[PDB]
Structures are given as structure tokens and as C-alpha cells.
Design an enzyme around this catalytic site. Structure first.
Site, PDB file in Angstrom:
ATOM      1  N   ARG A  54      13.201  32.487  44.366  1.00 52.98           N
ATOM      2  CA  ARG A  54      13.947  33.397  43.499  1.00 52.98           C
ATOM      3  C   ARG A  54      14.251  32.687  42.185  1.00 52.98           C
ATOM      4  O   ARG A  54      15.038  31.735  42.156  1.00 52.98           O
ATOM      5  CB  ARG A  54      15.225  33.867  44.194  1.00 52.98           C
ATOM      6  CG  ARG A  54      15.922  35.037  43.527  1.00 52.98           C
ATOM      7  CD  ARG A  54      17.036  35.585  44.412  1.00 52.98           C
ATOM      8  NE  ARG A  54      17.913  36.475  43.665  1.00 52.98           N
ATOM      9  CZ  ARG A  54      17.605  37.729  43.373  1.00 52.98           C
ATOM     10  NH1 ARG A  54      16.440  38.228  43.774  1.00 52.98           N
ATOM     11  NH2 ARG A  54      18.453  38.482  42.687  1.00 52.98           N
ATOM     12  N   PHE A  59      19.585  32.430  34.260  1.00 52.63           N
ATOM     13  CA  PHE A  59      20.549  32.460  35.350  1.00 52.63           C
ATOM     14  C   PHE A  59      20.342  31.228  36.230  1.00 52.63           C
ATOM     15  O   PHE A  59      21.140  30.288  36.160  1.00 52.63           O
ATOM     16  CB  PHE A  59      20.408  33.769  36.145  1.00 52.63           C
ATOM     17  CG  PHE A  59      21.416  33.931  37.264  1.00 52.63           C
ATOM     18  CD1 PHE A  59      22.562  33.144  37.327  1.00 52.63           C
ATOM     19  CD2 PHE A  59      21.206  34.877  38.260  1.00 52.63           C
ATOM     20  CE1 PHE A  59      23.478  33.291  38.364  1.00 52.63           C
ATOM     21  CE2 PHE A  59      22.115  35.026  39.301  1.00 52.63           C
ATOM     22  CZ  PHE A  59      23.254  34.232  39.352  1.00 52.63           C
ATOM     23  N   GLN A  62      16.293  29.289  42.448  1.00 53.31           N
ATOM     24  CA  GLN A  62      16.750  29.097  43.817  1.00 53.31           C
ATOM     25  C   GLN A  62      15.598  28.704  44.734  1.00 53.31           C
ATOM     26  O   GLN A  62      14.524  29.321  44.711  1.00 53.31           O
ATOM     27  CB  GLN A  62      17.426  30.354  44.357  1.00 53.31           C
ATOM     28  CG  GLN A  62      18.007  30.141  45.723  1.00 53.31           C
ATOM     29  CD  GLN A  62      18.757  31.352  46.194  1.00 53.31           C
ATOM     30  OE1 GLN A  62      19.069  32.243  45.403  1.00 53.31           O
ATOM     31  NE2 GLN A  62      19.059  31.393  47.480  1.00 53.31           N
ATOM     32  N   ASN A 101      24.825  29.951  49.774  1.00 53.64           N
ATOM     33  CA  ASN A 101      25.483  30.166  51.052  1.00 53.64           C
ATOM     34  C   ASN A 101      25.575  31.662  51.306  1.00 53.64           C
ATOM     35  O   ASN A 101      25.178  32.483  50.477  1.00 53.64           O
ATOM     36  CB  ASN A 101      26.873  29.507  51.104  1.00 53.64           C
ATOM     37  CG  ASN A 101      27.846  30.063  50.063  1.00 53.64           C
ATOM     38  OD1 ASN A 101      28.029  31.273  49.936  1.00 53.64           O
ATOM     39  ND2 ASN A 101      28.487  29.167  49.326  1.00 53.64           N
ATOM     40  N   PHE A 112      20.564  26.089  44.299  1.00 55.49           N
ATOM     41  CA  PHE A 112      20.009  26.619  43.065  1.00 55.49           C
ATOM     42  C   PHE A 112      20.261  25.656  41.922  1.00 55.49           C
ATOM     43  O   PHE A 112      21.250  24.916  41.911  1.00 55.49           O
ATOM     44  CB  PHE A 112      20.559  28.009  42.721  1.00 55.49           C
ATOM     45  CG  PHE A 112      22.059  28.105  42.733  1.00 55.49           C
ATOM     46  CD1 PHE A 112      22.745  28.285  43.926  1.00 55.49           C
ATOM     47  CD2 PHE A 112      22.774  28.069  41.544  1.00 55.49           C
ATOM     48  CE1 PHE A 112      24.131  28.398  43.940  1.00 55.49           C
ATOM     49  CE2 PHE A 112      24.149  28.185  41.552  1.00 55.49           C
ATOM     50  CZ  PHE A 112      24.827  28.354  42.752  1.00 55.49           C
ATOM     51  N   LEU A 121      30.942  31.327  39.696  1.00 53.85           N
ATOM     52  CA  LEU A 121      30.652  30.727  40.983  1.00 53.85           C
ATOM     53  C   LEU A 121      31.615  29.604  41.347  1.00 53.85           C
ATOM     54  O   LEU A 121      31.575  29.138  42.486  1.00 53.85           O
ATOM     55  CB  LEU A 121      29.227  30.185  40.998  1.00 53.85           C
ATOM     56  CG  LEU A 121      28.148  31.193  40.580  1.00 53.85           C
ATOM     57  CD1 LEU A 121      26.800  30.499  40.562  1.00 53.85           C
ATOM     58  CD2 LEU A 121      28.154  32.375  41.540  1.00 53.85           C
ATOM     59  N   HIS A 125      30.767  28.134  45.472  1.00 54.42           N
ATOM     60  CA  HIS A 125      29.547  27.383  45.734  1.00 54.42           C
ATOM     61  C   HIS A 125      29.818  25.920  45.424  1.00 54.42           C
ATOM     62  O   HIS A 125      30.371  25.607  44.367  1.00 54.42           O
ATOM     63  CB  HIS A 125      28.400  27.905  44.862  1.00 54.42           C
ATOM     64  CG  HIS A 125      28.037  29.325  45.150  1.00 54.42           C
ATOM     65  ND1 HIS A 125      27.059  29.667  46.061  1.00 54.42           N
ATOM     66  CD2 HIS A 125      28.553  30.492  44.694  1.00 54.42           C
ATOM     67  CE1 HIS A 125      26.976  30.984  46.136  1.00 54.42           C
ATOM     68  NE2 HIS A 125      27.876  31.507  45.322  1.00 54.42           N
TER      69      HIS A 125
END
Length: 164
Positions: A54, A59, A62, A101, A112, A121, A125
């Protein structure tokens, strides 16, 4: 004393380049050691050969699902999932390494690399590393991503290990 690990990235099998990461083992020792051991493969499994499933430009990238290759798998060296260790470190800009997660205390092997400041985040995370060399390679990875995260070519970790 903080370990550095590397990923050699390939695009549809063609070498792209190398990224290295410092793992903040002094602050998240349990989290960092998970990433470090999965990168050397010393426990008999890990990231070598796995893909980045991904990538969303502007952004993050991942990866780390080395058992189902699509965001539904992976496992830690501690078992199928381990706790959120702490949230000392924040998502302050591009190059931050952070754990994926599925809710509280569900860390596995997915992670990521942020390619933007992602402050929403923080406290959800666990941040545990940062790109040291090859941010330009990560920016190049980004251009194979898309708005919905699907990549236009297969982005794989062709080799990985520890440098120091």
C-alpha cells in the site's frame, strides 16, 4: 548504539536503490528489536522478499506483511501480536518509521514510512525509527503508488539486513 538496518528495493525485479533506517532502540527497545530481527531474518522469518502492498503518495508507504502480502498478515518475533510499547516519539515529518496495527496493542510486522507529517497518528501508532539514508529512494517508491494505495508495479524488499 542505535542499530541501522537496510532495505534494497526492487521494482518489478529491477533494482531501485537502498534505504537505511536507524532504530531508536534506546527508547522503544522491544519495538526496534522486532524490526531489526525481521530485517536480518535471524529468527527464521522476516522481511526479505516481501512487498510494499500500500503506497499513497503524499501520505506513506506501507509494508511488512510477509505472510499474505496484502495487509492482512504478518507476525512479530514475540508472537502474533505485541503491545504498544510507548508513544514517546511523534510523527514529525517525512521519513518517520511507525508501526501499523489493528487497534490497541495489536502490533505485528507491518509498518509504514511516512512521506508527510502525520500528526493525527500520534499516540495511536508507535514511532520507532527514521530514514537515515535514501530518502530519495522512498520518494521514488512513492511515484508507483496511487490515491487508493494500489501500486502500479511490484515494489519488493529484494534484500535486507543490519549495517551497524
Amino acid at each position: 548504539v542505535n542499530p541501522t538496518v537496510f532495505f534494497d528495493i526492487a521494482v518489478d525485479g529491477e533494482p531501485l536503490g537502498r534505504v537505511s533506517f536507524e532504530l531508536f532502540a534506546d527508547k522503544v527497545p522491544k519495538t526496534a528489536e522486532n524490526f531489526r530481527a525481521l530485517s536480518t531474518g535471524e529468527k527464521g522469518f522476516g522481511y526479505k522478499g516481501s512487498c510494499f502492498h500500500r503506497i499513497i503518495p503524499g501520505f506513506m508507504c506501507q509494508g511488512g506483511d510477509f505472510t499474505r502480502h496484502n495487509g492482512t498478515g504478518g507476525k512479530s518475533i514475540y508472537g502474533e501480536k505485541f503491545e504498544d510499547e510507548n508513544f514517546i516519539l511523534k510523527h514529525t515529518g517525512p521519513g518517520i518509521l511507525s508501526m501499523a496495527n489493528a487497534g490497541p496493542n495489536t502490533n505485528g510486522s507491518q509498518f509504514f514510512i511516512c512521506t508527510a507529517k502525520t500528526e493525527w497518528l500520534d499516540g495511536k501508532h508507535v514511532v520507532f525509527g527514521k530514514v537515515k539514508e535514501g530518502m530519495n529512494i522512498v520518494e521514488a517508491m512513492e511515484r508507483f503508488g496511487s490515491r487508493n494505495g494500489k501500486t502500479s508495479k511490484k515494489i519488493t524488499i529484494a534484500d535486507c539486513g543490519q549495517l551497524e
